Ligand SMILES: *[C@@H](O)[C@H](C[C@@H]1CCNC1=O)NC(=O)[C@H](CC(C)C)NC(=O)OCc1ccccc1
């Protein structure tokens with residue numbers, strides 16, 4: 130089997146992607162109702178030097194937007210900022226607007242990326258939000274405005290819109306309220322990412338996935354109290370676990386308690402000593418308990 | 429940027445997925461026009477024992493079929509085998525039939541999986557055909573009939589439908605004409621997968637991907653002739669590389685010849701020294717050259 134990232138199906142999102150162009154900039158927007166949301170730097174005169182967003186908005190030429198998807202062309206009625214996004218009122222309502230909500234993801238939470246190029250959906254893949262508000266994706270020029278979404282209990286949530294890449298290659302975006310994850314600015318200046326704190330919950334999930342896949346060299350009958358692991362995590366840039374509850378099913382199927390896997394984390398946090406788990410050379414925190422449960426058992 | 433296995437968007441496929449139930453079996457089918465294609469073992473009395481497909485077909489009663497797509501009830505008009513698939517003529521035309529073709533994938537080629545459960549699309553992810561005609565596909569019970577597809581040259585091709593899992597965990601399916609990849613039978617019987625042979629072309633692509641992403645610890649200026657590499661590969665379960673032409677753009681952009689990366693391959697197959705390469709602990713052959721070119725540079 131193995132453990133691989135998957136994405137939820139993208140069909141309900143694709144009809145919402147449009148191409149937004151202004152001046153020499155082209156990126157993607159999200160068309161819902163009679164509004165299109167896109168990163169505000171599309172109206173920046175020059176995206177390599179610092180941008181004065183007040184000047185850009187007050188001087189904006191609504192008729193100088195080009196917004197299109199296939200046989201649809203959209204006129205801009207009015208424009209405003211909401212955080213780091215432009216909210217553009219347009220003169221047509223999207224006939225394929227799905228029921229949807231907006232919410233923010235938190236560190237350790239997984240979601241899907243619909244990566245789009247110049248208004249055209251190209252690829253769909255799963256990611257996971259890190260403590261500093263970055264994701265490791267695969268964005269290149271033309272993919273700003275790409276959208277992250279999650280389906281929960283049949284509800285479509287929009288959670289991410291892509292804005293920029295940091296000097297170290299990490300990817301940064303906003304929620305659909307225009308709040309940038311991790312507090313970064315939509316400027317080219319160059320910005321630092323601090324140290325990410327690993328999701329302990331997701332690492333446990335990972336080890337359970339390994340066990341289900343038959344690998345067991347890393348496990349023993351020694352256990353380490355939550356209560357004690359949390360004291361360690363703390364000072365080792367690992368999150369601390371509130372309860373063992375999310376794992377009860379996975380413990381049942383495997384026969385191994387959480388407390389036994391906490392020992393593994395503390396022994397292996399430096400590395401595998403030339404060994405591997407699900408082909409990775411070190412601990413992976415990009416898979417949630419629910420992600421793993423669903424991939425191994427279809428729940 | 430980085431290297432993620434990506435899937436092409438699934439929207440054009442999702443309206444084609446239907447639930448197919450018969451006897452004690454529930455799986456997925458592909459509804460195109462007035463036809464539903466699904467694995468023929470859906471009519472098997474007992475899928476845990478050897479199946480006589482002639483007896484099962486003579487015993488079929490069309491009213492025991494239940495086929496559904498949301499609120500649509502698809503009545504079965506007639507049934508026949510085509511290879512290892514059932515082709516069911518149904519009493520309604522799919523109004524969302526996309527323009528499409530059928531084609532077979534070959535070892536080393538990438539394509540997308542839309543994994544479906546009880547007729548409901550669940551996940552989408554990219555895979556790559558292995559030398560023995562298998563994929564590592566994350567399939568579990570209830571996912572038979574899941575579809576593989578690729579969007580290439582402006583057309584949607586259906587290339588895979590899921591049938592079974594081998595004793596070693598590999599997954600086996602057919603093309604949509606009903607020929608099982610790798611010559612496997614649609615029986616619960618035990619079937620052997622020979623040795624997996626890695627696509628050398630895809631491994632070079634992968635290492636170029638690493639170079640483009642700034643990872644360079646494994647490379648040196650020592651090179652190895654194409655002829656020497658193929659002589660090595662013949663006895664080390666790697667394919668032989670016909671010529672270096674497909675990599676010219678990647679060679680130009682990185683400054684490294686294929687012949688240097690060939691030497692790299694021969695050195696890293698003995699082990700990584702506990703190191704990692706785009707986070708993998710061993711060589712990965714799941715990305716084609718054009719897949720890598722397009723993810724890193726677009727167009
Ligand atoms: C989309 O407009 C674009 C996506 C970047 C480009 C390369 N990989 C990405 O994620 N965003 C920008 O170009 C962005 C706009 C600023 C005004 C915030 N600037 C940016 O990301 O610069 C950093 C960078 C540019 C090009 C390659 C590598 C890093």
Ligand SMILES: *[C@@H](O)[C@H](C[C@@H]1CCNC1=O)NC(=O)[C@H](CC(C)C)NC(=O)OCc1ccccc1
Nearest residue numbers: 469475567568569570572591592593614615616
């Ligand atoms: C879909 O009907 C199912 C998908 C299998 C189930 C487990 N993982 C998959 O991909 N296919 C079968 O159950 C198939 C039935 C025909 C061969 C008659 N048999 C099969 O795959 O048996 C091997 C196996 C069964 C259950 C768990 C693990 C391996």
